[PDB]
């Protein structure tokens, strides 16, 4: 092996004359309006096939393949999304027909316009929580025991009707990378603080104890204090029937997960111990024998629309910009989930589009919000659902039980859904493991997942979700606040250039000093970077070159004074010693000592290092050269080129050359636009790499020698 | 001028074998431990100095020369401290005796405690302002002559409140939360709050009963409150208001225009006061045209008063934000002024001294401030080398509360509008700002305007935290949509540059230089992953997917014993096979992405080459990539996992992945992330960009 190289040094106003750049034309706005108002047949085509997915990819669909597939996983989906949607009515304190409306709409909607085909459409206990506590508030704030219940599902039907007019909004203004904000300690933190929230929630539902609705914040603990409190009144045989049907739930979910490949399809625990449950309580009159509580008849049929509450939209938008977000995070993340595994393209946009419009469509028919169970979608995922039309079955499903289905749930204790609701809760409790993980891998991950699951528990999930987004991005500055900024050394005698302190036997060359800062230049880091510098040159710029200036006033004095003319190589002092006191300006002319040195009165160049006559000191510098290898900084802003120029100023008043080295052509582009170059400091300060400065610095010298 | 290198091809691990490294340890917390409990007796010296600099600093003054500057730069800023404080006081909408108390206390307490020599402690109008919207928010709040009194003990206890919690910042030395402030965003928060503070002021030069308006559109409410009453305004007061404005506008023109000219600047505020006063006094004015007058104001303190423990759970977050904003102002102006003057500034022990000068403000009933940049500017153009000027400006606010407080009996409230007015000029003059920060960097524009539409539409308090917020959200745009590049070799040399920017670019066969300039995180690595497919040309998950399929179609082919395997190459006695397709069911695909294992089979399989029995896989030409991690700063749990991946799949489908102009540091970060794997081994990183295609020449060749 051998690095052999043999080229002239570069600088990159010497690399633009040396090789041609090609003419590259620079789009603009106006010219990406050419393309977006272009309206050709092809474009308008593909925009409403865009718009209409399933036009798209309806006759793609393999009848002799999926269907069969489809057919089953449709079937599994939908017993899961009944049970689970009567579960989330019980959470949202109305009646379960609405949880099943929340079921059937959705999905039939998103079937139209839905890019995934893996995930099923449908509410999820976080999503189900937050509408709960939307629908409290928005009581609790209007102003003017079956009326309370009409009040809750009207509050409940705007709530929806208004996130899934965001989300539409937001879908057709093309903004579906809001993903991306999330990061995965957030939302695993915020999953797993939801889940105890929902754990919490269940709580009242095993004991069947009464607890009156509590607004955020911290509404987990006075939950908590509220069904302590009652403890002595807990129903016996409603715990038990919960522990009972949660253990086994449990037990059932390792044993399918344990053997994967074995269990041919995933065993319908949920829906098994709902039958039995529901029998053993009619059967044995439960609800008379031990005074459970059971969910009762419910209305078949679906509601009359319901024109949204202007007043509920002003009470709750806050709530209702939260859901929407939640909602399409966890859509979103679910969906991509499946397709890096199945290999299908998603939009994110259209994704809105169709949440948003199934949230619009369930709302107007009284239906709280919801987007996609990660459970219900593995269910359907692992039955074999490979299209979008197996959450269709689904949904068929949920209208078979609104019509004429419903009576068979009628005897059935909510204690149950609640066990069934924990069952799936268990493993997002899991998740706890992931402090011990990230505090080994990166305390910054780990430090935003222990502040939002101490936020959403603290506050609510609303106000938590948005504490945590606001501080994980506030992590972004911690990470760069302090940068360890480095001074670089030569070894080897040769290009290769490392940190001072790491390598034995560097070679430093003499009044050569390189500076490394590994983070990019903005507000939060500027100040340190600045000070940093200072202390790795060993000396302040600013404060040499002010220094010098009075000493350059004085000698100004005495030659007008004529006590000492000045040499023609020298300044002749007749007078054995100055005996000069200090100046003291007052305020207004400080500012004279910031000016440049100029030296064109003087007939013969002084330099600073050497002694200055008539007692003058001034503190002795040996730079020469400073490098600031900015290969590691991304981006600058007005507050770092603001600085940077400042530096770079001060710098080149102490005759200290400065060449910043490492930057690519874009950044010295973005460089010019700031009007950082001027007359004092001209872009050939910009070299290619470190060794091209050094060797310029030391020709430079070897000429001056 | 020939750049000539020849050295033997440095990889990281070959390079930490070849040199010798020093066995620095750079840190552990025990040695951290250690060096807190050490109490060094010297340390403890220090510490004493620390929070008392007063000690320090006081025998270093030079009587000599800095005491006659202190004492008329105490005076002149003592006088414009208490029309200020008169003024803000009517801002507060509290009796205009109880805003000496802020000129007073906080600057006394500021002369013990305080590391800056030039800041004139005191309250300003944008913190009046939030002090007078927290008493309002208060009172409202608050469950069942009277009214004042009410205003000022809401008042008080939100100052302690607020100096409570500064001191809590201070000792817990935490004092560069004033880093997160940006250039930007406080230019727009200060000239909304100057639009707020003329709004404010209109209430009183029409004067006009206005009611306490609450936030969110505090600022729209007032504008219709005063135009819906713009018949009752007095002409009086109104001509009154414009005369002073102008005239103190003019003069200000003047002291800017002639500074060297001028050896003090010409007091024109207490000048135009004065004449306000004498003619108010003269003509008798309040009984002529019935002009607002301060009125008779009690002599003397008042008794210290307990705070309430009702206002502070009302307004703790609103104390939480006069907090932030006061600590924010007085570190901007200080640290202006230190930088001038060349001194250390100590940024916790300011918090420190702010949060006594407040909290004791706040116990002798006043509301407090941390300083006006109109008033230190004062200070300075006079010219004050020490705190002693604050505290001369603190005897002259007593001697104003006690003897000649009837003096500033007959003074128009129009007319300190009007003062008010005079110096928002400063700050409405950023508005040039949205024009030059359009052209120079439109994320700072954005921030510029979004900050000021916030505190335009919300209130001040709540208008900050939301600035905040969309700040840190532009860093996070800064970085959304790296311009992701791939670059070639130019000139036979070492340098590489982007490959549609220069002619004649040479770009070794099967090689690809990919760079992504920004650090990668969670909104970075999805732009990163999808950046770096679209530049190779093809998908290596799909890739690796496709080659298994084939090669488990090849595996079933054999043990059905249609082809034989033969090391030359495949060799089937029957070509009439038909193409099927196995369509693996759910569980089972994940098989698909495994790295192929050929160990069974005889000869090695390359799949670049043409397939037997009509077997089709996307060919690849690329051999070596090559990723320029120079520019690249960290990466977070999200982004590594994501680019482990990435990783893994090209080494899956055979293809050699470096990672080069990455730091020692970088690395060693990187072993801690328990990335490297006995797949993903670190032999990969390599120094510079030539060092790696160099070695990918020699492995080839």
């Known amino acids: 092996n051998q690095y052999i190289v043999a080229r002239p040094v570069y600088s990159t106003n010497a690399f633009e004359e040396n090789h041609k750049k090609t003419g590259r034309h620079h789009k603009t706005f106006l010219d990406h309006l050419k393309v977006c108002c272009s309206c050709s047949p092809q474009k308008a085509k593909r925009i409403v096939l865009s718009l209409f997915p399933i036009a798209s990819w309806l006759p793609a669909y393999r009848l002799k393949e999926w269907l069969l597939s489809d057919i089953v996983s449709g079937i599994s989906t939908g017993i899961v999304a009944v049970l689970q949607g009567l579960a989330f009515a019980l959470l949202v304190d109305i009646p379960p027909v609405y949880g099943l409306y929340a079921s059937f709409f959705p999905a039939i909607i998103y079937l139209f316009f839905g890019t995934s085909r893996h995930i099923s459409v449908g509410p999820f206990p976080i999503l189900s929580m937050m509408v709960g506590l939307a629908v409290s508030g928005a009581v609790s704030k209007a102003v003017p025991l079956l009326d309370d219940e009409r009040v809750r599902v009207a509050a409940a039907a705007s709530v929806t009707v208004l996130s899934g007019i965001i989300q539409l909004a937001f879908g057709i203004l093309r903004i579906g990378f809001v993903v991306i904000y999330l990061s995965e300690s957030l939302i695993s933190g915020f999953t797993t603080a939801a889940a105890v929230h929902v754990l919490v929630s269940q709580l009242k539902f095993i ?141 994110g946009n259209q994704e809105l589009i169709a949440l948003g419009l199934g949230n619009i469509v369930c709302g107007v028919f009284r239906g709280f919000a919801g987007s996609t169970a990660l459970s219900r979608s593995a269910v359907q995922e692992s039955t074999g659902g490979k299209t979008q039309i197996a959450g269709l079955i689904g949904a068929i499903i949920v209208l078979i039980v609104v019509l004429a289905i419903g009576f068979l749930l009628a005897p059935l204790q909510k204690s149950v859904l609640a066990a069934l609701a924990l069952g799936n809760l268990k493993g997002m409790l899991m998740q706890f493991a992931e402090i011990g993980r990230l505090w080994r891998k990166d305390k910054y991950d780990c430090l935003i997942w222990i502040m939002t699951f101490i936020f959403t528990i603290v506050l609510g999930l609303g106000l938590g979700l948005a504490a945590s987004v606001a501080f994980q991005l506030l992590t972004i500055v911690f990470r760069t606040q302090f940068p360890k900024c480095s001074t670089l050394a030569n070894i080897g005698r040769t290009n290769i250039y490392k940190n001072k302190k790491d390598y034995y036997d560097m070679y430093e060359p003499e009044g050569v000093k390189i500076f490394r800062c590994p983070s990019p230049i903005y507000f939060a880091n500027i100040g340190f970077f600045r000070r940093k510098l200072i202390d790795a040159v060993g000396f302040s710029p600013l404060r040499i070159l002010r220094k010098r200036n009075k000493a350059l006033r004085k000698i100004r004095k005495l030659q007008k004074q004529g006590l000492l003319q000045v040499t023609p190589k020298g300044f002749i002092c007749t007078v054995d010693t100055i005996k000069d006191s200090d100046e003291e300006l007052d305020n207004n002319q400080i500012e004279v000592l910031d000016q440049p040195i100029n030296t064109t009165d003087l007939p013969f160049h002084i330099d600073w290092n050497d002694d200055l006559p008539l007692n003058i000191e001034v503190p002795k510098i040996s730079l020469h050269s400073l490098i600031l290898d900015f290969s590691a900084v991304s981006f600058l802003d007005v507050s770092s080129v603001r600085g940077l120029k400042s530096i770079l100023q001060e710098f080149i008043r102490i005759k200290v050359d400065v060449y910043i080295v490492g930057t690519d052509d874009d950044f010295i582009e973005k460089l010019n636009r700031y009007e950082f170059f001027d007359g004092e400091v001209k872009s050939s300060i910009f070299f290619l790499t470190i060794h091209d400065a050094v060797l310029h610095i030391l020709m430079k010298k070897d000429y001056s020698t």
Do not use: W
Not at 209 to 218: I, N
Not at 223 to 250: G, R
């Open 207 to 347: 004991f069947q104890l009464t607890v009156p609705s509590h607004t955020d914040p911290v509404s987990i603990f006075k939950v908590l204090y509220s069904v302590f409190s009652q403890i002595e009144k807990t129903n016996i045989a409603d715990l038990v029937t919960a522990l009972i049907v949660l253990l086994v739930v449990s037990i059932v979910k390792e044993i399918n997960q344990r053997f994967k490949d074995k269990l041919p399809v995933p065993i319908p625990i949920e829906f098994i111990m709902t039958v039995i449950a529901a029998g053993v309580s009619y059967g044995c009159d439960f609800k008379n024998r031990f005074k459970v509580a059971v969910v009762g008849d419910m209305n078949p049929g679906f509601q009359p629309p319901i024109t949204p509450d202007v007043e509920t939209f002003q009470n709750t938008v806050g709530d209702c910009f939260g859901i929407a977000m939640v909602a399409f995070a966890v859509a979103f993340s679910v969906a991509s989930v499946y397709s890096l595994k199945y290999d299908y393209p998603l939009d």
